[PDB]
Amino acid sequence: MAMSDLPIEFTELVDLMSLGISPQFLDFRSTTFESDHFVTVRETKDGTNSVAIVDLAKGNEVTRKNMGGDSAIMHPSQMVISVRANGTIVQIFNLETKSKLKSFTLDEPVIFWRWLSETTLGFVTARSILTSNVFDGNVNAKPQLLTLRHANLNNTQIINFVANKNLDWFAVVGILQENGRIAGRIQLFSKQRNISQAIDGHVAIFTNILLEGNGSTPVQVFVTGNRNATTGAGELRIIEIDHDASLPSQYQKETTDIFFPPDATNDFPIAVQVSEKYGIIYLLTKYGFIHLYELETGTNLFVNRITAESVFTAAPYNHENGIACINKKGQVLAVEISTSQIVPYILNKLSNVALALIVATRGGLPGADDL
Amino acid sequence: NLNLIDM
Amino acid sequence: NLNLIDM
Judged by CB atoms closer than 8 Å, whether chains meet at A199 and B7 is answered as yes
- Dihedral pair phi/psi, residue A369, rounded to 5°: -70, -25
Judged by CB atoms closer than 8 Å, whether chains meet at A237 and B7 is answered as yes
CA distances from A368 to A302, A352, A357, A365 (A): 19, 11, 6, 8
What's the distance, Cα to Cα, between the start and end of chain A in Å?
Answer: 24
Which chains have at least 3 CB atom pairs separated by less than 8 Å from chain C? A
Nearest to C6 among A65, A89, A103 (CB): A65
> Residue A72: CB partners within 8 Å, gap ≥ 6?
A32, A40, A42, A51, A81, A82, A83, A84
Nearest to C6 among A66, A89, A103 (CB): A66
CA distances from A353 to A2, A177, A238 (A): 22, 43, 22
How far does A193 lie from chain B, in Å, by closest CA?
Answer: 9
Alpha carbons within 13 A on the beta-carbon side of A348: 11
Nearest-angstrom CA–CA distance, A324 and A286: 13
- Dihedral pair phi/psi, residue A153, rounded to 5°: -95, 0
How far does A164 lie from chain C, in Å, by closest CA?
Answer: 31
How far does C3 lie from chain A, in Å, by closest CA?
Answer: 8
Burial of A6 (0-12, 13-18, 19+ CB in 10 A): middle
Residues 1-7 of C with CB under 8 A from A: 1-7
* Residues A101/A113, Cβ–Cβ less than 8 Å: no
* Residues A161/A170, Cβ–Cβ less than 8 Å: yes
* Residues A190/A237, Cβ–Cβ less than 8 Å: no
Nearest-angstrom CA–CA distance, A337 and A330: 23
Residue type, position A181, single letter: R
DSSP A97-146: T--EEEEEE-SSPEEEEEE-SSSEEEEEESSEEEEEETTSS-TTPPPEEE
The resolution, in angstroms to one decimal, equals: 2.0
Nearest-angstrom CA–CA distance, A295 and A208: 9
Q: Which domains does chain A have, with CATH numbers?
A: 3-338 (2.130.10.110), 340-371 (no CATH)
Q: What is the CA radius of gyration of chain C?
A: 5
Taking alpha carbons only, the member of A218, A28, A193, A27 closest to residue A114 is A28
Q: 3-class SS at A358?
A: helix
Number of CB pairs, chain A paired with chain C, less than 8 A apart: 31
Nearest to A190 among B4, B6, B7 (CB): B4
A190 — contact with chain B (CB < 8 Å)? yes
Approach to solving: X-ray
Nearest-angstrom CA–CA distance, A207 and A40: 26
A168 — contact with chain B (CB < 8 Å)? no
Beta-sheet strand order (sheet of A289-294): A269-275, A280-285, A289-294, A300-305
CA distances from A90 to A78, A83, A102, A162, A175 (A): 18, 6, 7, 21, 25
Taking alpha carbons only, the member of A353, A343, A236 closest to residue A283 is A236
